[PDB]
Each structure stands twice: as structure tokens, then as C-alpha cells.
């Protein structure tokens, strides 16, 4: 995995790859690493597949129960802390999870929480998580500004995952894009790297390391 999510002028961008690995064996190229917890809350998945899948679907059930009991949508802070407190109970048992809880609420605004299986929980504007995080950081950090347009931010997120998909042997498949605003999350499609790489190479004039 490579996953990222960053905050900017126009909300939150969330971009993830779609590869599953079993060592050097490519297990899948078409895997969903984003979970839509609710219309205003997203969760990203990196690490052990089922650990992430099982416990973030469980997180969704806990968030659903909160709004039934409190007649109100759970805060991003509270949703992230349910997940972090859960994994902390299992600390040492060998869970492997690198997650980002992204979403909007009126009281918080757009918010991103990094939560991992060591029990670390951090609020922040930018995170990249997974085996290809460094590759994504390299592109994102050198092109990131707060004042990016929704169009440019969407592309930068897409291009950052592409960068990692290329260099990281354990990332690839396709880019899944999301945009989160005051009105909730908006899906911006699946982008197969098989076609996207050549489209980007040609149009951008980049990736000159490759035989074109």
C-alpha cells in the first residue's frame, strides 16, 4: 500500500492504490482500500487487509450506533478514537493497521486523523501511509499549497499515488480518488495505472527515466 489524504482550501483529498500482496506474490490489483463509513466520514486502509477491513467495518457499526443513541453524527475525533482505543487493547497481539479517518462536521470542519496499530493517534493536514508512503510524500510535499484548486488537488493526489505505484514494488493496480467537502464525500473514480501512466507521461512530459 500507498495511501494519502491532505487538507486544503477546498476541503480534503483522499487517494489510495489498490494492490494486495502476499509477499512477492501479487494477490490482487482491484482492491478497495477506502471504506465509506457514512456520507461525511471516510476511512483508509493500509497494513493487514482483514485487520483493516474487519475493524473499520466494525468502526462503521459503532458510528451508526452513536447516531441512533445521540441523534447526531459522530465527530471525526470520536470515530478515530474508537478505532485507536480498540487497537490499543490488542497492542502486542500483532495487529497491523495504518489508517486515516477523514471527514467533515460543522463543529470540527474538515479533519484528518492518522491512527495506527501501535496506538498512535494524530490530527494533521497531510499524511501518507503504507509501504509507498515516502514516494507519495516526495511528490505531494514538493507540489502542495493550501491554495490549490479542487481540480489541481485532485490531480496532485492522483499523481502522488501514481508516483508510488511506479517505484514501490508493493503498490500499484489503480488509483481511487475521493474529495470531501462540507456537503460530504464525492467519489472521483477509479484510475487504472496501466493507462494512467502513459497518459501522464505524455501529457506531463514526466517519467523520463522510462523507455517511452
Amino acid at each position: 500500500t500507498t495511501t494519502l489524504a491532505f487538507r486544503f482550501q477546498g476541503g480534503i483529498i483522499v487517494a489510495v492504490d489498490s494492490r494486495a500482496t502476499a509477499g512477492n506474490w501479487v494477490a490482487s490489483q482491484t482492491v478497495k482500500k477506502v471504506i465509506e463509513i457514512n456520507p461525511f466520514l471516510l476511512g483508509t486502509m493500509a497494513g493487514g487487509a482483514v485487520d483493516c477491513q474487519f475493524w473499520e467495518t466494525w468502526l462503521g457499526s459503532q458510528c451508526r450506533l452513536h447516531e441512533l443513541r445521540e441523534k447526531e453524527r459522530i465527530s471525526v475525533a470520536a470515530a478515530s478514537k474508537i478505532l485507536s482505543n480498540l487497537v490499543y487493547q490488542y497492542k502486542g497481539a500483532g495487529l497491523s493497521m495504518g489508517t486515516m479517518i477523514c471527514g467533515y462536521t460543522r463543529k470540527e470542519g474538515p479533519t484528518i486523523y492518522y491512527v495506527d496499530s501501535d496506538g498512535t493517534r494524530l490530527k494533521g493536514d497531510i499524511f501518507c501511509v503504507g509501504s509507498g508512503q515516502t514516494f507519495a510524500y516526495g511528490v505531494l510535499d514538493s507540489n502542495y499549497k493550501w491554495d490549490l484548486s479542487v481540480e489541481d488537488a485532485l490531480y496532485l493526489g492522483k499523481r502522488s499515488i501514481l508516483a508510488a505505484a511506479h517505484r514501490d514494488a508493493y503498490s500499484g493496480g489503480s488509483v481511487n480518488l475521493y474529495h470531501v467537502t462540507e456537503d460530504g464525500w464525492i467519489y472521483h473514480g477509479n484510475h487504472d495505472v496501466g493507462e494512467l501512466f502513459w497518459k501522464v507521461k505524455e501529457e506531463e512530459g514526466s517519467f523520463n527515466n522510462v523507455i517511452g
Partner: protein
């Protein structure tokens, strides 16, 4: 004294039969099932005019496709609802689907008899559980503290129930619309209620497949009260 799980000589559990009396002292709750939806309505019955009536929560969401109204010792319902919500969400977690209205009701009715010498007494509250699912469509269930549940086309519980049920017997037919059913609940509530029915001391709700379970606002119900009186003056 005498055991909590004792049978009477007539073959009934004393404690269950006594909890049934407690339910008859409860505020009126009515439910009507149609092909366009199920309507749930209740008498709020504030004990004093200083009590803020919108804080009286007697109609309650269980899931998006299941709703619930109560009558009797309403404090006893809190844990029953908590169970229902957990059962409903848990089923969705295990099976990636909505849970059947009957199965939900059955899960709640299992709690009912878990009393004796588990909890110390039966519940002192009856529930109307209304919802929709793909298999059996729109449904209304009456869940007693005996652990028994009946499906109903229409049903009233609480103090005004015997009179309201007789009225529902005549008025219900298989081609009722949702609008007609809303009015019918309001009509029968105003009949059996002590104080005069208004948008503050009565509350409506429905569950439709499209929009799920909704509690009506006091503004929305007010217009249905006005629409009801206008239609009764017109003959």
C-alpha cells in the same frame, strides 16, 4: 411473599399478568400498517404544563427501516431499545444486509422472559414495532412482556386501547393510503385522549421503504390536525 416465576391455578404467570395491568395505565400508542407505509402515533401526556413536551421521547428509531412506539413503564423500554439497535446493527455487520422486522421483534421478545430468581421482574412496557423489509413488506408487531408477539394490520395499546381497537376494527381496510392512515391515527387519538389533541401533546411518525423511519415535526403534524378537523366538518 411468593416466587417471581410462579404459576396461578389458571395456568398463567402472576408477574406477567400483573405487568399487563401496568401497561393499561400507560399513555395511548397506535400503529397502522398500509401498502404505502406504517404509521406510528402516541399520546405524549405531560404530567404538568411546565414540562417541555418535545423532551417526551415515546417514538424511537431502531434502524433506518425499523421504528418503535411504547406504552407503560417507559423507563423499562430503554434497555429493550438498546438491545434492538444492537441486534439490528450487529446483524448488518455479520450479514451485510438489513435485518427482518420479525427477526428483530423475536430478538426483543427473547429478553422479555429472561427474568426470575437475568433481571428480577418482567418488563412493564409494551412495544409496537413497525418496519419494512424486502421479503414480507410493511409490517407492524405488538411485543408484550410475556415474550409473545402478534403481527397486526392495526393496533392500539395503553389506557385508551379497548375503545381505540374497536374503532380500528371498523376503519381499517387493505387499500388505505398513508395520508388516510395518518388522519385515522390522529382521529382515534383525539377520541380517547383526556386533554384536547394538539401538535404538542401528540406525535406522529411513519416508516416508508423510500425515506425510512421518520418522526414528524410539530409543524407537519399541526397541518394534519387542521386537515382532519376540516374534513370532519364537511359532512
Amino acid at each position: 411473599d411468593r416466587g417471581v416465576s410462579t404459576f396461578s391455578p389458571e395456568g398463567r404467570l402472576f408477574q406477567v399478568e400483573y405487568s399487563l395491568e401496568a401497561i393499561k395505565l400507560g399513555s395511548t400508542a397506535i400503529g397502522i400498517a398500509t401498502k404505502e407505509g406504517v404509521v406510528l402515533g402516541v399520546e405524549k401526556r405531560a404530567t404538568s404544563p411546565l414540562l417541555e413536551s418535545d423532551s417526551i421521547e415515546k417514538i424511537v428509531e431502531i434502524d433506518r427501516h425499523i421504528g418503535c412506539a411504547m406504552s407503560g413503564l417507559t423507563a423499562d423500554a430503554r434497555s429493550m431499545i438498546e438491545h434492538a439497535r444492537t441486534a439490528a446493527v450487529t446483524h448488518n455487520l455479520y450479514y451485510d444486509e438489513d435485518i427482518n422486522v420479525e427477526s428483530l421483534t423475536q430478538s426483543v421478545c427473547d429478553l422479555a422472559l429472561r427474568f426470575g430468581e437475568l433481571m428480577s421482574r418482567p418488563f412493564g412496557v409494551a412495544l409496537l414495532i413497525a418496519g419494512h423489509d424486502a421479503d414480507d413488506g410493511y409490517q407492524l408487531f405488538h411485543a408484550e412482556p410475556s415474550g409473545t408477539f402478534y403481527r397486526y394490520n392495526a393496533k392500539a395499546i395503553g389506557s385508551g386501547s379497548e375503545g381505540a381497537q374497536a374503532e380500528l376494527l371498523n376503519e381499517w381496510h387493505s387499500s388505505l393510503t398513508l395520508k388516510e392512515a395518518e388522519l385515522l391515527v390522529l382521529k382515534i387519538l383525539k377520541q380517547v385522549m383526556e386533554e384536547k389533541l394538539d401538535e404538542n401533546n401528540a406525535q406522529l411518525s411513519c416508516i416508508t421503504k423510500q425515506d425510512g423511519f421518520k418522526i414528524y415535526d410539530n409543524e407537519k403534524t399541526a397541518e394534519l390536525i387542521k386537515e382532519l378537523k376540516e374534513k370532519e366538518a364537511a359532512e
